[PDB]
Amino acid sequence: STGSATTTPIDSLDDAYITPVQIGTPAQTLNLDFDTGSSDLWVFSSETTASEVDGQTIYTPSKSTTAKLLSGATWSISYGDGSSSSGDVYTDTVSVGGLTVTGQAVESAKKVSSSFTEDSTIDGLLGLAFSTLNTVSPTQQKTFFDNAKASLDSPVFTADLGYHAPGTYNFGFIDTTAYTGSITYTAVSTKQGFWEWTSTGYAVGSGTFKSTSIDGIADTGTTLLYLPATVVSAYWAQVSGAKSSSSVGGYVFPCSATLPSFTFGVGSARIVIPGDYIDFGPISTGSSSCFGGIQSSAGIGINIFGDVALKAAFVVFNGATTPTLGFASK
Ligand SMILES: O=C(CNCc1ccccc1)Nc1scc(-c2ccccc2)c1C(=O)NCc1ccccc1
């Protein structure tokens, strides 16, 4: 089997991408944030505290004839922004572009934190990291990809995120028309539960490529590109007036600037992020100070190749017995 679905930016800055997902019988369609940095499929629901729902579409398990409460199961997650959610668990039928998994754990939110409530465009997350990170207790549950993978023509999914435009998630096949040149595959460590790999270096604009190992994760659920402070300083040094602001919480730059590209290495291959991808607009409405799309990972503990990086590439998440990651230019 295979599946394909279009993924769409939630706003004009590409802060995140949402992909429609069918849950239950009859189908309830929710727009989920496909997240290769986490492993829970969780949704706003009829059980979510009413005050914490503000425009999201909810899953109502009582209206699904295939929903079954998973007895005694709960879940609870927190993310790096201090945001969180928790609730109970149903199994139900879940489909992405007709690719169907029966018995998928659907984690129904009883509580969500303010950042989720305040974002009306995201009805939940669909995790695509490794199932070792799934938070369901006392019995850990499998991701949608793990449940689907044996049925797929090939045990893979691909992310083709657009810059200020829709893109595509494919499951089970490689669309060889979606990229240029060849796909360069690179080794993955699953020890922390992520699609963790090692970039071979970087360049800023037309500058000299620096060969240096940069360990990080391919994370579709993170907006920006988080890299070591030395690398990030090298980038922003090329933008007149750019500086790290403690109060804002990262590098800001004059909105009138033209941003240079940023290149990262995948083996001997090179992925070029155009400068415009690195502009996240005014820090507050009407400001002429703009927020940078490349930021320091110093306080994170891990580098994150988030959407800023991934959207410059066609990315293969290869879930063979020994997983690997593939990157191609596009
Ligand atoms: O958690 C993820 C992937 N899920 C991102 C997500 C999606 C929707 C809503 C909320 C979050 N990736 C990882 S791995 C490690 C971190 C991290 C980040 C900051 C501090 C400590 C750990 C993050 C993460 O939270 N990414 C999103 C993010 C939020 C705020 C600031 C930077 C990055």
Coordinates of C-alpha atoms and ligand atoms in Angstrom, one line a residue:
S1 CA 0.0 0.0 0.0
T2 CA 0.9 3.7 -0.2
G3 CA -0.5 7.0 0.9
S4 CA 0.0 10.6 -0.1
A5 CA -1.4 13.8 1.5
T6 CA -0.8 17.5 1.0
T7 CA 0.7 19.4 3.9
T8 CA -0.1 23.2 4.1
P9 CA 1.6 26.0 6.1
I10 CA -0.6 27.2 9.0
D11 CA 0.3 30.9 8.4
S12 CA 2.3 33.2 6.2
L13 CA 5.6 32.5 8.0
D14 CA 5.5 28.6 7.7
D15 CA 5.4 28.4 11.5
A16 CA 4.1 24.8 11.1
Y17 CA 2.4 22.6 8.6
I18 CA -0.9 20.8 8.9
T19 CA -2.0 17.6 7.1
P20 CA -5.6 16.3 7.0
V21 CA -6.1 13.0 8.8
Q22 CA -9.3 10.8 8.9
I23 CA -10.1 9.3 12.3
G24 CA -13.0 7.0 13.1
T25 CA -16.1 5.8 11.5
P26 CA -17.7 7.7 9.9
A27 CA -14.5 9.7 9.3
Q28 CA -13.7 12.7 11.4
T29 CA -11.1 14.8 9.6
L30 CA -8.7 16.7 11.8
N31 CA -5.7 18.8 10.6
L32 CA -2.6 17.4 12.4
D33 CA 1.0 18.6 12.7
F34 CA 3.1 15.7 11.4
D35 CA 6.0 15.6 13.8
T36 CA 9.1 13.6 13.2
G37 CA 10.4 14.8 16.6
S38 CA 7.7 13.0 18.7
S39 CA 5.8 9.8 18.8
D40 CA 2.3 10.4 20.0
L41 CA -0.8 10.9 17.8
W42 CA -2.9 13.2 20.0
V43 CA -6.0 15.2 19.2
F44 CA -8.2 17.9 20.6
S45 CA -11.4 16.1 21.5
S46 CA -14.9 16.2 23.0
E47 CA -13.1 15.5 26.3
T48 CA -10.9 18.5 26.2
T49 CA -11.7 21.1 28.9
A50 CA -14.0 23.5 27.1
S51 CA -12.1 26.6 28.0
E52 CA -9.0 25.2 26.4
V53 CA -10.7 24.7 23.0
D54 CA -10.7 27.8 20.8
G55 CA -11.6 27.0 17.2
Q56 CA -9.9 23.6 16.8
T57 CA -11.8 20.7 15.3
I58 CA -12.4 18.0 17.8
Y59 CA -12.4 14.2 17.7
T60 CA -15.5 12.8 19.4
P61 CA -14.9 9.1 20.1
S62 CA -18.5 8.5 21.1
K63 CA -19.5 9.2 17.6
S64 CA -17.1 6.7 16.1
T65 CA -18.4 3.1 15.8
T66 CA -14.8 1.8 15.6
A67 CA -13.5 3.7 18.6
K68 CA -12.6 1.6 21.7
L69 CA -11.3 3.1 25.0
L70 CA -8.0 1.6 25.8
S71 CA -8.6 0.6 29.4
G72 CA -6.4 2.3 32.0
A73 CA -4.2 4.1 29.4
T74 CA -3.2 7.7 29.8
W75 CA -0.7 9.9 28.2
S76 CA 1.2 13.1 29.0
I77 CA 3.7 15.1 27.1
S78 CA 5.7 18.3 27.3
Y79 CA 7.7 20.1 24.6
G80 CA 10.6 22.5 24.7
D81 CA 8.5 25.6 24.7
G82 CA 7.0 24.5 28.1
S83 CA 3.8 23.5 26.3
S84 CA 2.0 20.3 27.3
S85 CA -1.0 18.1 26.9
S86 CA -2.5 15.0 28.4
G87 CA -5.5 12.7 28.4
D88 CA -6.8 9.2 27.8
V89 CA -6.5 6.8 24.8
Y90 CA -8.7 5.2 22.3
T91 CA -7.9 2.8 19.5
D92 CA -9.6 3.7 16.2
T93 CA -9.2 3.6 12.4
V94 CA -6.9 6.3 11.1
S95 CA -6.2 7.1 7.4
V96 CA -3.8 9.5 5.6
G97 CA -4.8 9.8 2.0
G98 CA -6.6 6.5 2.2
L99 CA -3.5 4.7 3.7
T100 CA -5.4 3.0 6.5
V101 CA -4.4 1.7 9.9
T102 CA -6.9 -0.1 12.1
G103 CA -6.4 -0.2 15.8
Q104 CA -4.3 3.0 15.9
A105 CA -3.8 4.6 19.3
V106 CA -5.5 8.0 19.2
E107 CA -4.6 10.0 22.3
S108 CA -7.5 12.1 23.2
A109 CA -6.7 15.3 25.1
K110 CA -8.4 16.1 28.3
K111 CA -6.0 19.1 28.9
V112 CA -3.8 21.2 26.6
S113 CA -1.6 24.2 27.5
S114 CA -2.2 27.7 26.4
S115 CA 0.0 27.6 23.3
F116 CA -2.1 24.9 21.8
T117 CA -5.4 26.6 22.7
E118 CA -4.2 29.8 21.2
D119 CA -3.4 28.1 17.9
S120 CA -6.7 27.4 16.2
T121 CA -5.1 25.9 13.1
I122 CA -3.6 22.7 14.7
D123 CA -6.1 20.0 15.8
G124 CA -3.3 17.7 17.2
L125 CA 0.0 16.1 16.4
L126 CA 0.8 12.9 14.5
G127 CA 4.2 11.7 15.7
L128 CA 6.6 10.1 13.3
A129 CA 9.7 9.6 15.5
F130 CA 10.5 6.2 16.9
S131 CA 7.9 4.4 19.0
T132 CA 10.3 4.2 22.0
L133 CA 9.3 7.9 22.7
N134 CA 5.6 7.2 22.9
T135 CA 4.2 8.4 26.2
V136 CA 1.2 6.1 26.7
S137 CA 1.2 4.5 30.1
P138 CA 1.2 1.7 31.3
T139 CA 1.4 0.2 27.9
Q140 CA 3.4 2.1 25.3
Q141 CA 1.7 2.4 21.9
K142 CA 3.0 2.5 18.3
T143 CA 3.1 5.4 15.8
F144 CA 1.0 5.5 12.7
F145 CA 4.1 4.8 10.6
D146 CA 5.1 1.8 12.7
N147 CA 1.6 0.4 12.4
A148 CA 1.5 1.0 8.6
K149 CA 5.1 0.0 7.7
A150 CA 4.7 -3.7 7.1
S151 CA 1.8 -3.1 4.7
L152 CA 3.7 -0.4 2.8
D153 CA 5.3 -1.1 -0.6
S154 CA 8.5 0.1 1.0
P155 CA 9.0 0.9 4.7
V156 CA 9.5 4.7 4.2
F157 CA 7.9 8.0 4.3
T158 CA 9.0 11.3 2.7
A159 CA 8.6 14.9 3.6
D160 CA 8.5 17.5 0.9
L161 CA 7.7 20.8 2.7
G162 CA 7.1 23.9 0.7
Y163 CA 8.4 27.5 1.3
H164 CA 5.3 29.7 1.6
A165 CA 3.4 26.9 -0.3
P166 CA 1.9 23.5 0.2
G167 CA 3.9 20.3 0.1
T168 CA 3.6 16.6 0.4
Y169 CA 3.9 13.7 2.7
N170 CA 4.2 10.3 1.0
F171 CA 4.1 6.9 2.7
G172 CA 5.5 3.8 1.1
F173 CA 7.1 5.1 -2.0
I174 CA 9.7 7.6 -3.4
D175 CA 8.4 10.1 -5.9
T176 CA 11.4 10.3 -8.2
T177 CA 9.9 13.4 -9.9
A178 CA 9.8 15.4 -6.7
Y179 CA 13.5 16.2 -6.5
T180 CA 16.6 17.0 -8.6
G181 CA 19.8 15.0 -8.8
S182 CA 20.2 12.0 -6.4
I183 CA 19.2 11.3 -2.9
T184 CA 22.1 11.1 -0.5
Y185 CA 21.5 8.7 2.4
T186 CA 23.2 9.2 5.7
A187 CA 23.3 7.1 8.9
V188 CA 20.8 7.4 11.7
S189 CA 21.1 6.8 15.5
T190 CA 17.8 5.9 17.1
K191 CA 19.2 5.7 20.7
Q192 CA 17.4 8.9 21.8
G193 CA 14.3 8.0 19.8
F194 CA 14.8 10.6 17.1
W195 CA 15.9 10.6 13.4
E196 CA 19.3 11.7 14.6
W197 CA 22.1 12.1 12.0
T198 CA 25.4 13.9 11.5
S199 CA 25.7 16.8 9.0
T200 CA 29.2 17.1 7.4
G201 CA 29.4 20.9 7.7
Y202 CA 28.1 24.2 6.5
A203 CA 28.6 27.3 4.4
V204 CA 27.2 30.9 4.7
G205 CA 26.2 32.4 1.4
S206 CA 29.0 32.0 -1.1
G207 CA 31.6 31.5 1.6
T208 CA 34.0 28.6 2.2
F209 CA 32.4 25.3 3.2
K210 CA 33.4 24.3 6.7
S211 CA 33.8 20.6 7.2
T212 CA 32.7 19.8 10.7
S213 CA 30.4 17.1 12.2
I214 CA 27.1 18.5 13.4
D215 CA 24.9 15.9 15.2
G216 CA 21.2 16.8 15.1
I217 CA 17.7 15.6 14.5
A218 CA 15.5 15.9 11.4
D219 CA 12.4 17.4 13.0
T220 CA 9.4 18.4 10.9
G221 CA 7.6 19.6 14.1
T222 CA 10.2 22.3 14.9
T223 CA 9.9 25.5 12.9
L224 CA 13.5 26.8 12.9
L225 CA 17.1 25.5 12.4
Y226 CA 18.9 25.2 15.7
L227 CA 22.7 24.9 15.4
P228 CA 25.8 25.4 17.5
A229 CA 26.5 29.0 18.6
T230 CA 29.7 29.2 16.5
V231 CA 27.8 28.2 13.3
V232 CA 24.9 30.6 14.1
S233 CA 27.3 33.5 14.8
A234 CA 29.1 32.8 11.5
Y235 CA 25.8 33.1 9.7
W236 CA 24.4 36.3 11.4
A237 CA 27.8 38.0 11.1
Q238 CA 27.1 38.3 7.4
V239 CA 23.9 40.3 8.0
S240 CA 24.6 43.9 8.9
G241 CA 23.0 44.9 12.2
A242 CA 22.0 41.3 13.2
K243 CA 22.6 40.6 16.8
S244 CA 21.5 38.1 19.5
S245 CA 18.9 39.7 21.8
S246 CA 18.4 38.2 25.3
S247 CA 15.1 39.8 25.7
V248 CA 13.7 38.6 22.4
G249 CA 15.3 35.2 22.9
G250 CA 17.5 34.9 19.8
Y251 CA 19.1 36.6 16.8
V252 CA 17.1 39.5 15.3
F253 CA 18.0 41.4 12.2
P254 CA 16.9 44.6 10.4
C255 CA 13.8 43.7 8.3
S256 CA 15.4 45.7 5.4
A257 CA 18.3 43.2 5.2
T258 CA 18.8 40.8 2.3
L259 CA 19.7 37.4 4.0
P260 CA 22.4 35.1 2.6
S261 CA 21.7 31.5 2.0
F262 CA 22.9 28.8 4.3
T263 CA 24.2 25.4 3.1
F264 CA 24.4 22.2 5.1
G265 CA 26.3 19.0 4.2
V266 CA 24.8 15.6 3.8
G267 CA 27.8 13.4 3.2
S268 CA 29.5 14.9 0.1
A269 CA 26.2 16.5 -1.0
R270 CA 25.0 20.0 -0.2
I271 CA 21.6 21.4 0.6
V272 CA 21.2 25.1 0.1
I273 CA 18.6 27.0 2.1
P274 CA 17.8 30.2 0.3
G275 CA 18.1 33.4 2.4
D276 CA 14.4 34.2 2.3
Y277 CA 13.7 30.9 4.1
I278 CA 15.5 32.4 7.2
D279 CA 13.2 35.4 7.6
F280 CA 10.5 35.0 10.2
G281 CA 9.3 38.6 10.1
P282 CA 8.8 41.4 12.6
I283 CA 9.3 40.4 16.2
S284 CA 6.0 42.2 17.0
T285 CA 3.5 43.7 14.6
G286 CA 4.8 46.8 12.9
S287 CA 8.4 46.4 14.2
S288 CA 11.4 46.8 11.8
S289 CA 13.3 44.2 13.8
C290 CA 12.9 40.7 12.3
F291 CA 13.3 37.3 13.9
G292 CA 15.9 35.0 12.5
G293 CA 15.2 31.4 11.3
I294 CA 18.6 30.1 12.3
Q295 CA 19.2 30.2 16.1
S296 CA 21.5 28.7 18.7
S297 CA 20.9 25.2 20.1
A298 CA 23.2 26.1 23.0
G299 CA 20.3 25.9 25.6
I300 CA 18.6 22.9 23.9
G301 CA 21.2 20.2 24.3
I302 CA 20.7 19.0 20.7
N303 CA 20.8 20.5 17.2
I304 CA 17.5 20.5 15.3
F305 CA 17.2 20.5 11.6
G306 CA 13.6 21.9 11.7
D307 CA 11.4 23.1 8.9
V308 CA 13.8 25.9 7.8
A309 CA 16.3 23.2 6.8
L310 CA 14.0 20.4 5.8
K311 CA 11.9 22.5 3.4
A312 CA 14.9 23.1 1.3
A313 CA 15.1 19.4 0.6
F314 CA 13.2 16.3 -0.3
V315 CA 13.7 14.2 2.8
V316 CA 13.4 10.4 3.0
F317 CA 12.7 8.8 6.4
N318 CA 13.8 5.2 5.7
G319 CA 12.4 2.9 8.3
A320 CA 14.2 -0.3 7.1
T321 CA 15.6 -2.6 9.8
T322 CA 18.5 -0.2 10.0
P323 CA 16.9 3.2 9.5
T324 CA 18.6 5.9 7.4
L325 CA 17.8 9.4 6.2
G326 CA 17.9 10.6 2.6
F327 CA 18.3 14.2 1.4
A328 CA 17.9 15.5 -2.1
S329 CA 17.8 19.0 -3.5
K330 CA 14.6 20.1 -5.2
Ligands
LIG1 O1 9.5 18.3 20.3 C1 10.0 18.3 19.2 C2 9.0 18.0 18.0 N1 7.7 18.5 18.4 C3 7.6 20.0 18.2 C4 6.3 20.6 18.5 C5 5.3 20.6 17.7 C6 4.0 21.2 18.0 C7 3.9 21.8 19.2 C8 5.0 21.8 20.1 C9 6.2 21.2 19.8 N2 11.3 18.4 19.0 C10 12.2 18.9 20.0 S1 13.5 18.0 20.4 C11 14.1 18.9 21.5 C12 13.3 20.1 21.6 C13 13.6 21.2 22.6 C14 13.4 22.5 22.2 C15 13.7 23.5 23.1 C16 14.2 23.2 24.4 C17 14.4 21.9 24.8 C18 14.1 20.9 23.9 C19 12.2 20.0 20.8 C20 11.2 21.1 20.7 O2 10.6 21.4 21.7 N3 11.0 21.7 19.5 C21 10.1 22.8 19.2 C22 10.7 24.1 19.9 C23 9.9 24.8 20.8 C24 10.4 25.9 21.4 C25 11.7 26.3 21.1 C26 12.5 25.6 20.2 C27 12.0 24.4 19.6

